[PDB]
Amino acid sequence: LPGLDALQTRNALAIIAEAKKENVGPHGCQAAITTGLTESSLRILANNAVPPSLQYPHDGLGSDHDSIGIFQQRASIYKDIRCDMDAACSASQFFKVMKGVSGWQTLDVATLCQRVQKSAYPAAYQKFTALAVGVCKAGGL
């Protein structure tokens, strides 16, 4: 997919397929891809502060609080570690929260990412929104 390496691509393809399953369209796909790029560079990251995360396949390690997976979901909040460590399932968790945001379908993508993620660094998402448009287009959204 444009602008991604092969490892990022396998993760993005799983996210895109889940976006289609959940019927969230280009806009929803863009929010998930932007978020994954921003949080993990589209990598399923385990975390030694969340020991069960190490039992699932992972692309690398992260050391941000108790965040795990592509979306850096905090294990104290998103307690299903297996789900957090799966590209599609972790994306589904993102999409379900996203769909609770009134007007998500047209809300500025970087803003929407922040509504879902409650990041300390909301401006960070803006760096990846343009790339996300292209990734999602290439994937059929």
Numbering used by the authors: 3 to 143
Provide the authors' own sentences about this structure as they appear in the paper.
Muramidases are N-acetylmuramide glycanhydrolases which cleave the β-1,4-glycosidic bond between N-acetylmuramic acid (NAM) and N-acetylglucosamine (NAG) in the carbohydrate backbone of the bacterial cell-wall peptidoglycan. Here, the identification, characterization and X-ray structure of a novel fungal GH24 muramidase from Trichophaea saccata is first described, in which an SH3-like cell-wall-binding domain (CWBD) was identified by structure comparison in addition to its catalytic domain. A ‘domain-walking’ approach, searching for other sequences with a domain of unknown function appended to the CWBD, was then used to identify a group of fungal muramidases that also contain homologous SH3-like cell-wall-binding modules, the catalytic domains of which define a new GH family. The properties of some representative members of this family are described as well as X-ray structures of the independent catalytic and SH3-like domains of the Kionochaeta sp., Thermothielavioides terrestris and Penicillium virgatum enzymes.
The natural enzyme from Kionochaeta sp. lacks the CWBD and we describe its crystal structure. There is one subunit in the asymmetric unit, with two cadmiums, one with full occupancy, coordinated by His29 and His67 from the symmetry-related molecule and by four waters, and a second with an occupancy of 0.23, coordinated by His60 and five waters. There were no close sequence homologues with known X-ray structures for this enzyme. Similar to that of gp13, the Kionochaeta GH184 domain is mostly an α-helix bundle. It can be roughly divided into two subdomains, with one subdomain all α-helical and the second, residues 42–88, containing two (or four in TtGH184 described below) short β-strands and two very short α-helices with connecting loops. There are three poorly ordered ethylene glycol molecules from the cryoprotectant in the KsGH184 structure, two of which are close to the active site. A mutational study confirmed that Glu41 is essential for catalysis. Glu41 corresponds to the suggested catalytic Glu45 in gp13 and is located in the all-α subdomain at the end of helix 2.
